[PDB]
Amino acid sequence: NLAPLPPHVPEHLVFDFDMYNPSNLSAGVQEAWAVLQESNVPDLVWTRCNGGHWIATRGQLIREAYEDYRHFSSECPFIPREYDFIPTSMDPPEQRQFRALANQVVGMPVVDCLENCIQELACSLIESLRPQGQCNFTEDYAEPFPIRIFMLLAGLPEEDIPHLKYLTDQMTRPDGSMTFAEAKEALYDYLIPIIEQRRQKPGTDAISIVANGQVNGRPITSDEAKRMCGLLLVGGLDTVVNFLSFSMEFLAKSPEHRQELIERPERIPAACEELLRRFSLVADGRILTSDYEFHGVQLKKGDQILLPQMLSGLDERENAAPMHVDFSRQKVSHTTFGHGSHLCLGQHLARREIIVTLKEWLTRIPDFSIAPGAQIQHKSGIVSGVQALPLVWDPATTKAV
Amino acid sequence: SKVVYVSHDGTRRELDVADGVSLMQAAVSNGIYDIVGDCGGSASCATCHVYVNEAFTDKVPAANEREIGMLESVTAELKPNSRLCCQIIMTPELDGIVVDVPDRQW
């Protein structure tokens, strides 16, 4: 259903993209989104879907807009208009205060520190799966891995996982029982007590670091701490889940790319950077703070613009043959983690997660494919993803280390 | 090519950096934590602040307008040799550059 075309929007700029139901979805999420990049389609379009909003369609414009929070504000980052966290809806300068804090817990010293727990976590997941000949990757690995990391970071008990797995899915992907606000409220009701605890009896886990941190000149409030931790849990669980799944989906269909990484593990970090570009999966955006002209187009105050992170890398101006995966590519150009002041805090952590998953998976289960008779179902949205990934392999070809 | 990082406390580290890689990217990839590189290097954060050594200033390409703007927001003392090191890109000419790292980025 299409919102009436507001009067300031030129007709020849109209391209009715539904970011929640794009046309050729059974062809794959990224191809469906690549429709914004046919030679005929302009830099900036207006879609009437989802209440009306602009879309930037080229990496060059996505970058400038992200570099420019004074015109393009994060106050309203999601499409449509109708979710706290902290610091997603904040701009500089207030946003730096919370970035500082989040970096104490997911920053690169912490990530370097955790490499070995991370690998160990990846290894036992994979080792329990190896003998079975089969798994649903997204549920059996892509979800438990990042959730298990979060439990270690926040020093939360292992018995709690099922509970958060549930609260988390109801937010990330409603199985249809619970409202999103309800799922959010219930996440908050698990965190509240722990954060009270960790304030009154501080440990050295992620929650104590956040809950006792300083913002501005003074101690964070329980409520601010709560809002941040939920982002730390949510923001790293859903992007990671869906992204690992696209990755394994690709490698499952691509024996030679598998072969390359199996015969030559050194390329895995370059492989991961290529997979980040090709299977980019996030498309959030910005609100205009004032009337402003931008690449031949007049934009009104209050207009929302989709700035699809996933597209920059897929833009043939930024990478030759964008839809080809090539682990050797001279300059892997992308904004899969975003750009500008909001560039994913979890970028360091996300990379190890991917590199470790690839490293440990391939040295154990080098040969696997999609389960016969399945066709993978995709969803599109703010975080595009994969519904389920049934995989099979012959246990006889696998190895323990 | 070689880059030396000296910490506020006197700690020295040296890296071998590939041509075209930022002093930020090298530092953040290699355990030099007093460079944070928060924004990943589009000169949007000011957490990659260093003082270039006075024997190299006149060999590093000039700060652009975006850098200078973001330089106003540094939290450690701003000096004339202050630069955001995600904007300093390794080349033949930079062999042996010394950068001093201030005592804060946040």
Ligand code: HEM
């Ligand atoms: C495949 C992995 C990931 C991808 C593709 C990704 C993507 C992104 C992008 C594009 C943004 C910025 C959105 C914007 O500009 O508005 C973002 C923000 C964020 N990410 Fe991630 N992310 C990933 C993994 C993670 C992980 C592991 C964590 C750790 C929990 C995490 C935590 C966050 C947080 C807290 C923010 C808000 C940052 C801010 O707005 O300042 N992400 N992510």
Ligand code: FES
């Ligand atoms: S890394 Fe953000 S300004 Fe240099």
